[PDB]
RNA sequence: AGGAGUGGAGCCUGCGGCUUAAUUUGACCAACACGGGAAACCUCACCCGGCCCGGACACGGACAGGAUUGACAGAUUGAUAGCUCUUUCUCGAUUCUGUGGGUGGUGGUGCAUGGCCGUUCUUAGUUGGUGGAGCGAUUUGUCUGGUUAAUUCCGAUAACGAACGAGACUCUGGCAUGCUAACUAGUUACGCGACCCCCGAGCGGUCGGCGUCCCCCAACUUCUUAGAGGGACAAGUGGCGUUCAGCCACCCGAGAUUGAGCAAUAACAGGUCUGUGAUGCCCUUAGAUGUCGGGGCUGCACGCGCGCUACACUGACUGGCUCAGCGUGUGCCUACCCUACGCCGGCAGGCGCGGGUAACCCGUUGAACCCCAUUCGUGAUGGGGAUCGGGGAUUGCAAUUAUUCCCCAUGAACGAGGAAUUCCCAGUAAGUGCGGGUCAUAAGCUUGCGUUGAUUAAGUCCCUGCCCUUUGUACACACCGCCCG
RNA sequence: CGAGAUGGU
């Protein structure tokens, strides 16, 4: 279907971010966050909605696939040690982020 | 047939009949070494001649399979009783028939023999039988989860023109 | 008889076509003879894949 | 091609009632028989087979699309 | 019920007499052709022959929307019992070919 | 009209059994291709829409129209703002 | 068992299907063939059609 | 160098975005009138509801005062689904029930595969054996030069002798008054026969003119069909060529380039699991991801692609005259074909009665542009025909979100199109209409056929690309590469 | 000898 970059490289399998994108909520050890700044080297600064800011890192599965950006909404996994640091699990589209807030899942802080 | 059908429909329907008969015989007589069917007509009677390498398997213990095949050919295609006869005939020069060599390579692979040992086994027998050349190809998941192919060739081989 | 079809099984590629045909040939011969002897001569050399049909009066 | 969202008026099938075999004959005296429920006026069903009695109808269970009398 | 016993006997007697069966893969046609006239549908023929195959009493083949079935020695033994025929009968195929 | 007379029976039952000088109860149906006959005037019908029944009070001006002409299968469109890919200039590079 | 278990099928794509493989799309009605277009290219030589031009 | 355009207008149709219960989905030069994809139902996969088993076979249980099957009426229901509830007849070992196990699926993965197709790539390219050269990856053969559409030939030569592609080959077009021979094809002529005209030397005639008017037990094969052979070779003459291989002009001739099919080695994470009883693994399997009723695929601020009709006088309208070629036709489950002639109606259409399984009947296939005469008069006009009101037929089980067709009325934008950009060298481009496919109903698409018939070239490497050789490199994921502060 | 940078699948 429609490309949205432009290049020779048709050598991959297509992204298909479609159909049964079943909505995901927290388990234990997770938080929702908004991206505040993006740094070099595959890392970023993020704020979760109960107010603890963290330095955050892209998991190896999301490299060069799920492009994160400033003010974007993400799902983050906490560490049982080293509480200043965390890793990204998912990105929510602006269509999914409004459904989280419609289920009352997010405080009235997140931008959409 | 209360009034006869037109020649365009008649010549197409006679070709559709030979195609379905060849498919039925192909999958009934595969291990029994089938390679072709021929059909001929005479007043009140149709004779079907069938070619195979091991003709005793086409007959069975006292001709049982010729009687069973005569019954189902009559039952399916709507011939009247006793107007159909089946004759088995032995294939001459079986090394120069491509269908008998494709089936014997299939059963040799299905028994678990290694691919190159099997393929050079038929390549030798075709060239010893007196062909001017041949080409054997196998393709799919040969050794690993990513697909491959092999070509085996000997002698002369044309590709273009009539 | 003619049939013209797309070559592709699935609808992708540049748009090529196949052109199949079949040709049919027909003849007539008329005789001045008894009904008993057309049955003799219309029974030899007819071994190949040729239709033969005969009608008892048309002339 | 999805997970399934369920209905809530659930039955698999009904249950067919269980009853003892025969109450359409009576012995009244030694060697005296009565037939308690009637045969329908019919070609094949004319003997040994009986019409039901309902509160306002007589009905043949064998000829089931028809053979109903309104009393 | 799968079918009336009147139907089930009429399939087995035609199979035992002829030695073979043929039917097309279509559950909707109201009558099987040939000596299965006098009312049995070909759905009953397909379902009957499937039950006879999983017992080992017939062989099966298929091409271009048609089934083909052949009777075998264990099935001859079972049908001669089920139909109560004399032990000496073999009505379908016997004479040696030349 | 083989077994399409059943609606006309249910409509004339509802016209008969209504309280004096008050409207009948609804009869609800799938029959969208029924023509409005002069028997059907001053009657309540629920006409199926692909998921729900919409009620109609049959005015005499409706005569000769279909029942399906008064119960519509979709919502009128009103637009939200265009998305990515809607124009040639809209392209995204990471 | 139900009495209403079928709908009319006396014309259109509900009536007809391929004689080899039961498919309903892209079939050939010409000269009484009734094959699917992919099944025709497979059997054309055995039926007796050829290409010259 | 030029021709017809496309991009601008209205409408048709495919795609994105938005909207929605659903607007099912694949594909981004080599996707977008493509899936032979013209969806009323079916097709059908999507959305809202409801019946059904079409759960083989094995083991255990239950069971001939009986395992189980079917149903009238009232309530219920979109429904005449005994689906379910109340009631009480009916069938007869075929089922039911628990466990194990199967079976089906237009479900998922084309980045697990087979088969098929497209593309690199329409160009001239590719490879062993024995011998020679290098420690080796590799190389020569497969070439300095000339010649050709061509790795086509000549010749040269540490190589010799071969294989595939090219070419040959198959179908097709143009020629035969020579051959074979026709009541399912014609001509000529007369025994003649018949209607009409005197226009004709001359009468109303032997004799003339006109004929798809009619017999032949007349003669024949020019015109039609289609079998066998024939014919063209750079063969002849003049120039140019390491005088070879070839190239240019001209005579004679139907003809000195007719047009297609088939096509190598090695590749691509190209497309297809939605063509298949081709198929691995995964998922689901009775409150089913295996049948009926209704809805959607057509929804509309907006961006893009292939097309149809036009902006008029080299025209539009109303009469009159006169010419084609390729094809299809009573459906074998599946239930329908092509039509002459007569009558009724303005029209679409209706009734009656015949022929055709086809060189036999529709049919001498009375095609359109074009040709001859008339009316309008430079006016958004008698150019253009979008949009919209009212009425009448035909298909079908059903036409509203208008199936298609006929009639009166209404009368938009548009006055030759910005930056850009496509196809084409002779019976070709463009104009013009007719068959086949799909089809119960129906082309603004596509695949073939005839008819009218030009302007400009006979060249080049400039722009975009392809082939071969020499050359440089920090590239090999191969310039859409790699890399510095 | 006009101007001609850059590179998610």
From Swiss-Prot, chain A:
Biological process according to GO: ribosome assembly; translational initiation
Compartments reported by the entry: Cytoplasm
This protein's UniProt keywords: Cytoplasm, Host-virus interaction, Initiation factor, Protein biosynthesis, RNA-binding, tRNA-binding
Region entry Disordered, spans: 1-23
Gene Ontology CC annotation, any one: cytosol
Start-end of Basic and acidic residues biased regions: 13-23
Physiological role: Component of the 43S pre-initiation complex (43S PIC), which binds to the mRNA cap-proximal region, scans mRNA 5'-untranslated region, and locates the initiation codon. This protein enhances formation of the cap-proximal complex. Together with EIF1, facilitates scanning, start codon recognition, promotion of the assembly of 48S complex at the initiation codon (43S PIC becomes 48S PIC after the start codon is reached), and dissociation of aberrant complexes.
Family: Belongs to the eIF-1A family.
Name of the protein: Eukaryotic translation initiation factor 1A, X-chromosomal
Organism: Homo sapiens
Gene assigned in the entry: EIF1AX
Residues of the full protein shown: 4 to 115 of 144
Curated annotation (Swiss-Prot), chain B:
PTM sites of type Phosphoserine: 6, 35, 104
Location in or out of the cell: Cytoplasm; Nucleus; Nucleus, Nucleolus; Mitochondrion inner membrane
Any one GO MF annotation of this record: structural constituent of ribosome
Keyword terms of this UniProt record: Acetylation, Apoptosis, Cell cycle, Cell division, Cytoplasm, Cytoskeleton, DNA damage, DNA repair, DNA-binding, Isopeptide bond, Lyase, Membrane, Methylation, Mitochondrion, Mitochondrion inner membrane, Mitosis, Nucleus, Phosphoprotein, Ribonucleoprotein, Ribosomal protein, RNA-binding, Transcription, Transcription regulation, Translation regulation, Ubl conjugation
Modified residues annotated as N6-succinyllysine in this record: 132
Main location (coarse class): cytoplasm
Record entry for activity regulation: Endonuclease activity is inhibited by MgCl2 on apurinic/apyrimidinic DNA but not on UV-irradiated DNA.
GO BP terms in the entry: apoptotic process; cell division; DNA repair; positive regulation of apoptotic signaling pathway; regulation of translation; translation
EC numbers: 4.2.99.18
Complex formation: Component of the 40S small ribosomal subunit. Identified in a IGF2BP1-dependent mRNP granule complex containing untranslated mRNAs. Interacts with HNRPD. Interacts with PRMT1; the interaction methylates RPS3. Interacts with SUMO1; the interaction sumoylates RPS3. Interacts with UBC9. Interacts with CDK1; the interaction phosphorylates RPS3. Interacts with PRKCD; the interaction phosphorylates RPS3. Interacts with PKB/AKT; the interaction phosphorylates RPS3.
Protein name: Small ribosomal subunit protein uS3
Curated annotation (Swiss-Prot), chain D:
Glycyl lysine isopeptide (Lys-Gly) (interchain with G-Cter in ubiquitin) cross-link site: 26, 32
Subcellular location: Cytoplasm; Nucleus, Nucleolus
Annotated spans, Disordered: 1-14
Mapped zinc finger ranges (C4-type): 40-63
Parts forming coiled coils: none
Post-translational modifications reported in the UniProt record: Monoubiquitinated at Lys-26 and Lys-32 by RNF25 in response to ribosome collisions (ribosome stalling): ubiquitination promotes subsequent activation of RNF14, leading to EEF1A1 ubiquitination and degradation and rescue of stalled ribosomes. Deubiquitination at Lys-32 by USP16 is required for maturation of the 40S ribosomal complex.
PTM annotation (N6-acetyllysine): residues: 23, 32, 71
Function in brief: Component of the 40S subunit of the ribosome. Part of the small subunit (SSU) processome, first precursor of the small eukaryotic ribosomal subunit. During the assembly of the SSU processome in the nucleolus, many ribosome biogenesis factors, an RNA chaperone and ribosomal proteins associate with the nascent pre-rRNA and work in concert to generate RNA folding, modifications, rearrangements and cleavage as well as targeted degradation of pre-ribosomal RNA by the RNA exosome.
Subunit structure: Part of the 40S ribosomal subunit. Part of the small subunit (SSU) processome, composed of more than 70 proteins and the RNA chaperone small nucleolar RNA (snoRNA) U3.
Protein name: Small ribosomal subunit protein eS31
From Swiss-Prot, chain F:
Protein family (similarity comment): Belongs to the universal ribosomal protein uS19 family.
Record function comment: Component of the small ribosomal subunit. The ribosome is a large ribonucleoprotein complex responsible for the synthesis of proteins in the cell.
UniProt-recorded name of the protein: Small ribosomal subunit protein uS19
Assembly, per entry: Component of the small ribosomal subunit.
Keyword field contains Acetylation: yes
Disulfide topology: none
GO molecular function annotation: MDM2/MDM4 family protein binding; RNA binding; structural constituent of ribosome; ubiquitin ligase inhibitor activity
A single GO cellular-component term on record: cytosolic small ribosomal subunit
Recorded name of the encoding gene: RPS15
Broad class of where this protein is predominantly found: cytoplasm
Keywords noted in UniProt: Acetylation, Cytoplasm, Isopeptide bond, Ribonucleoprotein, Ribosomal protein, Ubl conjugation
Source taxon at top rank: Eukaryota
Subcellular localization: Cytoplasm
Cross-link (Glycyl lysine isopeptide (Lys-Gly) (interchain with G-Cter in SUMO2)): 59
One record GO biological process: positive regulation of signal transduction by p53 class mediator
Natural source organism: Oryctolagus cuniculus (Rabbit)
């Amino acid at each position: 279907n429609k490309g949205k970059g432009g290049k020779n490289r048709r050598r991959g399998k297509n992204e298909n971010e479609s159909e049964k994108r079943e909505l995901v909520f927290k388990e234990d050890g997770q938080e929702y966050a908004q991206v505040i700044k993006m740094l070099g080297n595959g890392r970023l600064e993020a704020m979760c909605f109960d107010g603890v800011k963290r330095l955050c890192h892209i998991r190896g599965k999301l490299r060069k696939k799920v492009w994160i950006n400033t003010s974007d909404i993400i799902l983050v996994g906490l560490r049982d040690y080293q509480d200043n640091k965390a890793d990204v699990i998912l990105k929510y589209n602006a269509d999914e982020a409004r459904s989280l807030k419609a289920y009352g899942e997010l405080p009235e802080h997140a931008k959409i | 047939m209360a009034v006869q059908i037109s020649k365009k429909r008649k010549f197409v329907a006679d070709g559709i009949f030979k195609a379905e008969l060849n498919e039925f015989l192909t999958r009934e007589l595969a291990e029994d070494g089938y390679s072709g069917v021929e059909v001929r007509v005479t007043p009140t009677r149709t004779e079907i001649i069938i070619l195979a390498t091991r003709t005793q398997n086409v007959l069975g213990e006292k001709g049982r399979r010729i009687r069973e095949l005569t019954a189902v050919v009559q039952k399916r295609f709507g011939f009247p009783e006793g107007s159909v006869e089946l004759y088995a005939e032995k294939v001459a020069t079986r090394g120069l028939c491509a269908i008998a060599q494709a089936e014997s390579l299939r059963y040799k692979l299905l028994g678990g023999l290694a691919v190159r040992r099997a393929c050079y086994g038929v390549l030798r027998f075709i060239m010893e039988s007196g062909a001017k050349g041949c080409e054997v190809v196998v393709s799919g998941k040969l050794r690993g989860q990513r697909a491959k192919s092999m070509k085996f060739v000997d002698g002369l081989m044309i590709h273009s023109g009539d | 008889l003619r049939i013209t079809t797309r070559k592709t099984p699935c609808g992708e590629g540049s748009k090529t076509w196949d052109r199949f045909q079949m040709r049919i040939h027909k003849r007539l011969i008329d005789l001045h003879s008894p009904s008993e002897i057309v049955k003799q001569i219309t029974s030899i050399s007819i071994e190949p894949g040729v239709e033969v049909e005969v009608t008892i009066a048309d002339a | 091609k999805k997970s399934y969202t369920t209905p809530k008026k659930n039955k698999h099938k009904r249950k067919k009632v269980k009853l003892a075999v025969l109450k359409y004959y009576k012995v009244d005296e030694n060697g005296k028989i009565s037939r308690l429920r009637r045969e329908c006026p019919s070609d094949e069903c004319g003997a040994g087979v009986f019409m039901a009695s309902h509160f306002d109808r007589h009905y043949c269970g064998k000829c089931c699309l028809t053979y109903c009398f309104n009393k | 019920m799968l079918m009336p016993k009147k139907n089930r006997i009429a399939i087995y007697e035609l199979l035992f007499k002829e030695g073979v069966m043929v039917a097309k893969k279509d559950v909707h046609m109201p009558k099987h052709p040939e000596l299965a006239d006098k009312n049995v549908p070909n759905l009953h023929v397909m379902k009957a022959m499937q039950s006879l195959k999983s017992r080992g009493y017939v062989k099966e083949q298929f091409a271009w929307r048609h089934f083909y079935w052949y009777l075998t020695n264990e099935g001859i033994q079972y049908l001669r019992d089920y139909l109560h025929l004399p032990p000496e009968i073999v009505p379908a195929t016997l004479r040696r070919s030349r | 009209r083989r077994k399409q007379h059943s609606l006309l029976k249910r409509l004339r039952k509802a016209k008969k059994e209504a309280p004096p000088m008050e409207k009948p109860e609804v009869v609800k149906t799938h029959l969208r291709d029924m023509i409005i006959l002069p028997e059907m005037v001053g009657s309540m019908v629920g006409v199926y829409n692909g998921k729900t029944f919409n009620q109609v009070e049959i005015k005499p001006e409706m005569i000769g129209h279909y029942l399906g002409e008064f119960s519509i299968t979709y919502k009128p469109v009103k637009h939200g703002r265009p998305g990515i890919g809607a124009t040639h200039s809209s392209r995204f590079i990471p | 068992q139900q009495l209403y278990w079928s709908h009319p099928r006396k014309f259109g794509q509900g009536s007809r299907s391929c004689r080899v493989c039961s498919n309903r799309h892209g079939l050939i009605r010409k000269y009484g063939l009734n094959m699917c277009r992919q099944c025709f290219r497979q059997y054309a030589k055995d039926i007796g059609f050829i290409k010259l031009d």
